[PDB]
Amino acid sequence: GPHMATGQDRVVALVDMDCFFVQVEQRQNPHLRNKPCAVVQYKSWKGGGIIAVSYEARAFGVTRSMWADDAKKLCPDLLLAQVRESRGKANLTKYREASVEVMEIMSRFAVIERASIDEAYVDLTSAVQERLQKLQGQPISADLLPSTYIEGLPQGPTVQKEGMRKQGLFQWLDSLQIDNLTSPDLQLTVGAVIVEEMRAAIERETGFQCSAGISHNKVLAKLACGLNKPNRQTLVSHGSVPQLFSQMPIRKIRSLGGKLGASVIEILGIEYMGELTQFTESQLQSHFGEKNGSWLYAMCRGIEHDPVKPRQLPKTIGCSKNFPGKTALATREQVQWWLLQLAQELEERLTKDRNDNDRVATQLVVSIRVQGDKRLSSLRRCCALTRYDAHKMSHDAFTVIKNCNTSGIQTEWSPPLTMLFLCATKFSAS
DNA sequence: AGCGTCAT
DNA sequence: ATATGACGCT
Numbered sequence: 001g002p003h004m005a006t007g008q009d010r011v012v013a014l015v016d017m018d019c020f021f022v023q024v025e026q027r028q029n030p031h032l033r034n035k036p037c038a039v040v041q042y043k044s045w046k047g048g049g050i051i052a053v054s055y056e057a058r059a060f061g062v063t064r065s066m067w068a069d070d071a072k073k074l075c076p077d078l079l080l081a082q083v084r085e086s087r088g089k090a091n092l093t094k095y096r097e098a099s100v101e102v103m104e105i106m107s108r109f110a111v112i113e114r115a116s117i118d119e120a121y122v123d124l125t126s127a128v129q130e131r132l133q134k135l136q137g138q139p140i141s142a143d144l145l146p147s148t149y150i151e152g153l154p155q156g157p158t159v160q161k162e163g164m165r166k167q168g169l170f171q172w173l174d175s176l177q178i179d180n181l182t183s184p185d186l187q188l189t190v191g192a193v194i195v196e197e198m199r200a201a202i203e204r205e206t207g208f209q210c211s212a213g214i215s216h217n218k219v220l221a222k223l224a225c226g227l228n229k230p231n232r233q234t235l236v237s238h239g240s241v242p243q244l245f246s247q248m249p250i251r252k253i254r255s256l257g258g259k260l261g262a263s264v265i266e267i268l269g270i271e272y273m274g275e276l277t278q279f280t281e282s283q284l285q286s287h288f289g290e291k292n293g294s295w296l297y298a299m300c301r302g303i304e305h306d307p308v309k310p311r312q313l314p315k316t317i318g319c320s321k322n323f324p325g326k327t328a329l330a331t332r333e334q335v336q337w338w339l340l341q342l343a344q345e346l347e348e349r350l351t352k353d354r355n356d357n358d359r360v361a362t363q364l365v366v367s368i369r370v371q372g373d374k375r376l377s378s379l380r381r382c383c384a385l386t387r388y389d390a391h392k393m394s395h396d397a398f399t400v401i402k403n404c405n406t407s408g409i410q411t412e413w414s415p416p417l418t419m420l421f422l423c424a425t426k427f428s429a430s
Numbered sequence: 431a432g433c434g435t436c437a438t
Numbered sequence: 439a440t441a442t443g444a445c446g447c448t
């Protein structure tokens with residue numbers, strides 16, 4: 001109808017770095033560039049656990065969450081770089097810093113929401129209308145979109161990938177209505193021109209390549225980004241949604257990869273996101289509750305209102321280490337020594353944070369997991385964080401958990417601890 | 431406040 | 439065989 005909202009009011013992009021930790025190591029070590037390559041943590045455990053994989057190594061089937069020794073069976077020439085270890089744990093300082101390089105450049109173009117160490121959303125609505133003016137009324141050249149895919153195109157009456165790409169892009173452009181400054185597709189198109197520039201800026205100034213999605217909301221931008229990785233960007237228009245969603249498994253939409261998505265599948269008897277359109281909102285609200293119901297009713301139509309939040313910094317600063325199986329911490333002396341390792345790294349990072357971003361954390365959260373409980377957090381207690389001091393912070397963290405020790409013995413800890421997690425939260429401006 | 435979900 | 443971050447529910 002004429003009163004029904006189509007969710008075309010915003011231009012939103014998600015930019016995600018291609019195999020980010022590997023790129024960071026490849027920039028540093030030229031010997032690793034353009035090779036099957038992976039980043040692991042903890043060498044002595046089956047060669048280390050893989051957390052990032054180059055696309056050359058992906059083509060042998062190497063994946064995240066693989067042990068390196070297993071990965072070598074698939075890929076014997078697989079090169080590896082290992083994560084820095086400090087105080088007996090993984091230290092991610094180099095990637096956090098690399099992330100700041102990327103985030104800052106993105107910030108010159110628009111207000112961003114940092115979504116992970118590697119990706120950010122971008123509300124390009126204002127930048128689009130500003131460019132749209134000063135473009136007078138000139139058409140948009142395909143030269144301006146040299147890595148952009150139009151989802152759903154080409155269609156209708158080349159055998160190579162770049163061949164298909166341009167044909168899709170030509171079809172799209174040749175249909176475009178530059179007469180109308182207020183057309184959503186035009187908005188998206190100009191949004192995509194800006195992301196080309198932004199992505200060019202990131203690579204020119206950091207050496208890092210990335211992919212992006214351009215659409216009208218965060219969920220479509222995120223999904224779009226993944227459609228043509230690596231080193232490419234994808235425009236998912238409102239019109240492209242019904243065909244796209246008609247074979248799109250539900251688990252692929254953001255926040256639907258867990259238990260909620262499974263229950264949508266199980267309770268409703270469906271597989272694809274598009275199948276959700278045949279249910280009334282009240283029906284959906286009835287099954288998955290009021291909030292999820294509303295969200296699903298609109299999302300299966302390509303409509304989502306979640307705003308890009310202005311927030312380039314993390315809201316919490318955290319430290320954890322798992323103590324699996326037999327390395328579980330079973331003495332009081334062990335627990336105190338590790339809380340101190342954690343407290344020391346956290347102090348280092350909080351002091352940095354205070355000087356960089358003019359703020360202080362005020363609350364400390366202590367998380368632990370106990371042997372046998374598969375709940376990845378068994379218990380969570382908190383205290384005041386009044387000083388950036390490792391010894392006090394570990395002493396406090398111990399105070400608030402020490403009563404979990406069921407061991408009648410003075411010097412023993414039971415049940416043995418399989419995770420320690422320290423988290424600084426509740427920031428105030430300093 | 432403490433716990434559960436989803437995710438990179 | 440084996441590290442963090444955002445946010446929702448009660």
Ligand SMILES: Nc1nc2c(ncn2[C@H]2C[C@H](O)[C@@H](COP(=O)(O)NP(=O)(O)OP(=O)(O)O)O2)c(=O)[nH]1
Pocket residue numbers: 016017018019020021022051052053064117118229230438441
């Ligand atoms: N320590 C740790 N780091 C992780 C884990 N999972 C991901 N990371 C880190 C390592 C990742 O590099 C980084 C970004 O996560 P993605 O974007 O989902 N994977 P990438 O960027 O490598 O490839 P592409 O995006 O092109 O598919 O987060 C984990 O379980 N543990």
Ligand SMILES: [Mg+2]
Pocket residue numbers: 016017018019020118
């Ligand atoms: Mg990435």
Ligand SMILES: [Mg+2]
Pocket residue numbers: 016017116118119438
């Ligand atoms: Mg990412």
